[PDB]
Structure 1
Amino acid sequence: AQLRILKETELKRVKVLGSGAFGTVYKGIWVPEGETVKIPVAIKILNEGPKANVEFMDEALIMASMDHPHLVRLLGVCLSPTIQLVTQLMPHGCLLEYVHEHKDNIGSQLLLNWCVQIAKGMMYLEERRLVHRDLAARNVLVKSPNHVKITDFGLARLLPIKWMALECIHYRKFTHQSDVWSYGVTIWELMTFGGKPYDGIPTREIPDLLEKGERLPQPPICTIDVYMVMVKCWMIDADSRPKFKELAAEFSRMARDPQRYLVIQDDRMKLPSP
């Protein structure tokens, strides 16, 4: 496992794509030694703090070692002004923006496929004991319509209430099963085609809401089948929630017959049986 260390001059910004609580993401170009190859790369500049350290390098090397189909790989890092995380550019952008823009041209197959892939990415993370802490549709990027990748895993190891599990809000106990909660919200966002969780509801009223038993509503295009899988991800007991093995297996089984589990309304109406 090898991390690339890039020069400040080897990276050239073009424009801002978006800035979060952690830092800022730049659409940039990367030029390896000489003048032959360029690249379409994304540059994450973290702003405060963390510092060129043995501790930092040790963490960056764990992230550089993360290698999946449905995880974004950390290509390299720059240090000279501040710490900058370098990543291959996903031209389609984040899944959250994608599902809103292509609402009318996304079917049941793709939606169920995204669920399988995100779960698969999370399995890898769980098997390597890396807890993501912040799994959301905005943190899943789009390589191609039928190919999404999870990003920003273990970013708290370097430095989202409505995605967080109740355990994490109160006791800050981040675990693989609290990531399952965030998965349920992530897939809910996908089913609603970019719906804002708990819309019109303040942040400080979320915990008491969840303790009464109230969860996010059944998405219009969901059958009770796929929705009960979601309901399971939001269980009060963390142990009761499904494992990422179970979720992948379930949406895989649903991906075989996709319009049996998601009803998206042609000119003709689609009629569900039970």
Structure 2
Amino acid sequence: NQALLRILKETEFKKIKVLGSGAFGTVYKGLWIPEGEKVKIPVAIKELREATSPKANKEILDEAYVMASVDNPHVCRLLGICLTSTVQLITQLMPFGCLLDYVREHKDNIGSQYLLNWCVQIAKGMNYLEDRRLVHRDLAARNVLVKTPQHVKITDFGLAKLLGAEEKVPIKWMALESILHRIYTHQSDVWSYGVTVWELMTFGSKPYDGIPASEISSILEKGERLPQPPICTIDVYMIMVKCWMIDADSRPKFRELIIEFSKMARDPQRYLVIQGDERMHLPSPTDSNFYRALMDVVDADEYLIP
């Protein structure tokens, strides 16, 4: 089968364990065993919470092909779909988990080089989506996955539109115009990018923690923003603050964020002030708890050598 979006039979994959139980579905660790091909590919399987009509299923398939068409090292591709009473979505298993949990878990061994490199990687992935004319609408550190500690990828950019974001909800990541008027653009994704950077620089703080979602548009209109993370120089904070300008056309563009964070990544200790920075190290595959705790098969990347 050479289809870009594989249509899977239930016999071709198995849910082995639960990973995560999220707003719109449950994600499982499993194996994809493509019929006749005698090979087992570690995958994540998301099973949607609600049963869908044959009408829901048509809109899902059309969007699914877009999600299987992306080809960028910083973007998670949809490998396949299975349409039964439930919809199941299959992707490569990202065996270090999401970046939000990763920065909370490793908050004492993450140095300036890693944080700035992730900022670059996320900006490159978002710029690739902008080139595909795709608005994410739900960018957050929970939706960035860790392939290796050195390399992260954007996911879950195919949800918000189909779930009705643009018609009559991650308020604390949303641009003011998204809250007020359901306007979603690459420039509203820049706002979410700024909040995602804030989550990384705070080692996974909750934005506006304990502030009611219903009060966020008012505090944004009064000019209040997320506070400067303790490790950040004013050079890095000013990038975040520029992502949260009310004028969406004045916010940085992803291609400008790639250039500026790439510059900072060349001299990372100038731009982030982390005690113990120089001596910091993160578990490899072999050493990682999280890694062995998924895995211990052919990796999706090997199998798909086009």
Scaled to the shorter chain, the TM-score interval is: over 0.9
2-side partners of 1:150 and 1:245: how far apart? 16
Q: Which has the higher contact order (CA 8 A, sep 6+)?
A: 2
Distance 1:71 1:105 in 2: 25
Q: Which residue pairs with 2:235 in the alignment?
A: 225
Structure 1 position 171 matched with structure 2 position 144:
no
Are residues 50 and 248 of structure 1, via their aligned partners in 2, closer, same or farther at CA, if it must alter by over 3 Å?
Answer: farther
Structure 2 CA distance for aligned equivalents of residues 165 and 75 of structure 1: 30
The Cα of 1:179 is off from its aligned counterpart by: 0.3
Distance 1:49 1:133, change over 3 A: farther
- Extract structure 1 runs of 4+ deviating beyond 6 A: none
Q: Are the aligned partners of 1:50 and 1:158 in contact in 2 as well (CA < 8 Å)? A: no
Which of the two has greater helix per residue? 2
Match of 1:264 among 258, 262, 274: 274
Identity %: 79
Task: Find out whether 1:193 has 2:203 as its counterpart.
Answer: yes
Q: Which runs of 5+ in 1 are unaligned?
A: 269-274
The alpha-carbon distance between structure 1 residues 253 and 32, as it changes in their structure 2 partners (threshold 3 A), is same
Unaligned runs of 5+ in 2: 164-169, 279-306
Letter aligned with residue 146 of structure 2: V
TM-score, normalised by the number of residues in structure 1: 0.94
Partner of 2:105: 101
Structure 2 Cα separation of the partners of residues 138 and 183 of structure 1: 12
Shift of 1:51: 4.5
Q: Hey, what does 2:20 align to over in structure 1?
A: 18
- The answer to which of 138-147 and 200-209 deviates more is 200-209
**Aligned residue pairs, count:** 268
1:116 partnered with 2:120: yes
Residues 14 and 212 from structure 1, CA distance in 2 versus in 1: closer, same or farther, beyond 3 angstroms? same
Is residue 74 of structure 1 aligned with residue 84 of structure 2?
Answer: no
Q: Cα–Cα, structure 1 residues 124 and 100, in superposed 2: closer, same or farther, change >3 Å?
A: same
Compute the TM-score of the two structures, normalised by the length of structure 2.
Answer: 0.84
CA distance in 1, matches of 2:263, 2:276: 25
For residues 4-29 of structure 1, give each alpha carbon's deviation from its aligned partner in whole angstroms, at most 9, with x where no partner exists: 01111222111211122221111111
| Residue-by-residue CA offset, 1:193-251 (whole Å, 9 max, x unaligned) | 01110012111111111111110000000000000000000001111111001101100
CA distance in 2, matches of 1:95, 1:41: 18
Show the 5 A alignment for 1:27-106: 27-34=29-36, 36-52=38-54, 53-106=57-110
Cα gap change, 1:240/1:49 in structure 2, threshold over 3 Å: closer, same or farther? Answer: farther
Take 2:46 and 2:131, find their aligned partners in 1: how far apart are those partners?
A: 26
Aligned CA RMSD, in angstroms, stands at: 1.6
Please tell me the residue identity of whatever aligns with 1:149: K
Question: SS in structure 2 opposite 1:78?
Answer: strand
